[PDB]
Structure formats: C-alpha cells, structure tokens
Amino acid sequence: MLTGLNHLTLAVADLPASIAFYRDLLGFRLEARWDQGAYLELGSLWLCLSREPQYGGPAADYTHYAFGIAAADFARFAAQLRAHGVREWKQNRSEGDSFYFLDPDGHRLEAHVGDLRSRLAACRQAPYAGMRFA
Amino acid sequence: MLTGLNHLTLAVADLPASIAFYRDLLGFRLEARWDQGAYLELGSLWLCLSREPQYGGPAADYTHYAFGIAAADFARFAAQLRAHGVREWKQNRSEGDSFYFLDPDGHRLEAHVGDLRSRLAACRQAPYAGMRFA
Ligand SMILES: [K+]
Ligand SMILES: [K+]
Ligand SMILES: [Mn+2]
Ligand SMILES: [Mn+2]
C-alpha cells in the first residue's frame, strides 16, 4: 500500500541556522516558513524543519539521511562544505563516493554517488559477510 | 549539487524484527540481508537497516519519516496496523490523512495522503502563525 517516501521531518533547535544550511549550502528551495518551521524541496524530496528550541540532536548511532549527487559534482561539493567548516562523521568505505557530514543540530547527512542498483551490483561481485540477495 | 533523497539508513537493535516489520507489515521488498544489516526498497526509496547493539531508539522529538499512500488505501492501512498492535505517536492534525506509528526501535513513521503542493495550497488558505510563502 505504501508508495515510497513522502517527506522527511527534522527537529531543529535553531530554525534560522538550519534554513540557511539546507537552503544555501545544500541547495534546497525554501517553499514556506513560519514561526515554528519550514518546508523545503530538493528534487522530489520534501523536507520539513520543525523548530524545537531545546533539541540537542541525536545520540551517536548509524541513523542517517543520504542525498544523491552526480559523480562530476562530488569533489566540488565535498571541498565546498569542508571550506565552510562542516564537520564530518565518517570517512567513506562503501561503494560509491560519499561525503558524511553533520547538520547544525548533529543530524547525520551524506552526499552519495550511486543508488541501490549500483550497490547491489557491487555486492553481488563481493557480497558482505553472510550476505544473501532477494 | 544534490539531486534528492538517495537512501534512508536506520539504526536497529533487532535486525530480524525490523526486517519483518518493514517487509512483511509495511510491504518493503527485501533486496539483500547480511549479518549486520539489510537493504529494502519501497517504490524509489532505498532503506538500509544497520544493526546497532543495545540501540534504544531516538529520544522524544519531532524527527520522523513519512511514506506516501493513496487516499483509497489509507483507512485499511491504519486499521491493519492498529489490529497488528502497532503503537501510535501522534493523532493527525495537519492537512491530509496521516497515521503516525512507531517502528520496533521507536523510529517515528507516518503514512500520509498528500504532497508538498497539496500542503502549500491548504496552508495558503489556513496559514500557520507567521507563515510566508516563496
Ligand atoms: K559509499
Ligand atoms: K497530516
Ligand atoms: Mn549511507
Ligand atoms: Mn509528517
């Protein structure tokens, strides 16, 4: 019955800082803003920012949100965010270029070259420990 | 230059339980499973489940992940998951039918009828406090 992802909503403590991050560094389009949140769009992704002034960010675990990027744009993106002072949380190890960075609250983000099909094809050629396919 | 959402990765304490939930209850297709994770697909959404020992779930905030559903399927989906004993975390108040439910770790999920455009149109008629559009 479900059709795919409809929207992603992130708690944010500092709404102005988060809008500026997602709009200006990550290139989201700001579609609406109000006293307690904002709606942005990137491709078909609907992002909601929900203002929660006491929010401290997530604890340390592997939950994260990956955005796509083309191969030819990857190096420039990584270099741009590095030059802006963005903090990284992981060095890439899996198939396809990836840049693993934190948002202003500490949500874990990724910019990734590739998709599920390229991952599965790389895994078929070199399956992970215990790996089995559909 | 980012293209949209590439994948969503969730930390899970009980990888078997989480696969069963997303595959068998929510209808994701299991594409690959290994000792420390799984890859599933729903429409264009690539979901990765990452095994995380002793993970206790997120703390309480509004961060959540919404999946789309057709209007004609909404009521039967909500009824199905209620019958299966899924726990709800919010009663719908915003435009478009929504069912707000927890996964086995306590990740906050939503099944939603509507999209960003239907939301913006409704908000222009009944705006949130301080709302601005662009
Ligand atoms: K990677
Ligand atoms: K709603
Ligand atoms: Mn990832
Ligand atoms: Mn929502």
Provide the CATH number for the domain around residue A85.
Answer: 3.10.180.10
Q: What number of residues does chain B have?
A: 134
Helix, strand, coil percentages for chain A (3-state, nearest 5): 25, 40, 35
A64: CA distance to ligand 2 center in Å? 24
The b-or-e profile of A57-72 (16+ CB within 10 A means b, else e) is bbeebbbbbbbbbeee
Q: Which DSSP string corresponds to A75-118? A: HHHHHHHHHTTPPEEE---SSS-EEEEE-TT--EEEEES--HHH
| Distance of alpha carbon A91 from alpha carbon A96, whole angstroms | 12
- DSSP class of residue A54 equals T
* Helices and strands per DSSP (H, E), number in chain A: 3, 9
Find the domain containing A58 and state its range.
Answer: 1-134
CA distances to B9, B13, B50, B52, B105 from B56, in Å: 16, 7, 13, 9, 7
CA of B121 to the centre of ligand 4 (A): 16
Cα of B88 from ligand 1 centre, angstroms: 34
d(CA A81, CA A79): 6
Which one of A36, A73, A131 has the shortest CB-CB distance to B32? Answer: A131
A112 marked ligand binding residue = no
Cβ within 8 Å, pair A42-B4: yes
Experimental method: X-ray
- Give the residue carrying structure tokens 């959404």: B45
Across the interface, do B7 and A134 touch by the CB < 8 Å criterion?
A: no
* Known catalytic membership, residue B110: yes
Nearest CA to A109 out of B102, B68, B2, B49 is that of B2
Q: What count of other Cβ atoms lies within 10 Å of the Cβ of residue A111?
A: 23
Burial A32-44 (b: 16+ CB within 10 A, else e): bbbebbbbbbbee
Do B34 and A129 make contact, defined as CB atoms within 8 angstroms?
Answer: yes
3-class DSSP assignment, residue A51 = strand
Q: What Å distances lie between residue A119 and A126, B2, B105, CA to CA?
A: 10, 19, 26
Please list every residue in chain A whose beta carbon sits closer than 8 Å to the beta carbon of residue B132. Answer: 32-34
Looking at A31, A52, A88, A110, which residue is catalytic?
A110
State whether residue B78 is helix, strand or coil.
Answer: helix
Given the residues B31, B52, B88, B110, the one annotated as active site: B110
Using alpha carbons, list the distances in angstroms from residue A25 to A60, A74, A125: 24, 14, 36
If one counts the domains in chain B, the total is 1
The minimum CA-CA distance between B92 and chain A, rounded to whole Å, is 15
Q: Which residue has the tokens 């060095």?
A: A91
Q: Facing residues of B48 across strands?
A: B9, B39
Residue appearing with tokens 């874990």? A108
Residue of A93, A97, A89, A98 lying closest to A128 (CA atoms) = A93
* Residues A66 and A111 sit within 8 Å (Cβ to Cβ): yes
What is the phi-psi region of residue B40: left when phi exceeds 0, alpha when psi lies from -120 to 50, beta otherwise?
beta
Q: What is the resolution of this structure in A?
A: 0.9
Q: Which ligand is nearest to the CA of A122?
A: 1
CB A69 within 8 A of CB A33: no
Are residues B116 and A66, on separate chains, in Cβ contact within 8 Å?
A: no
Q: What amino acid occupies position A65?
A: Y
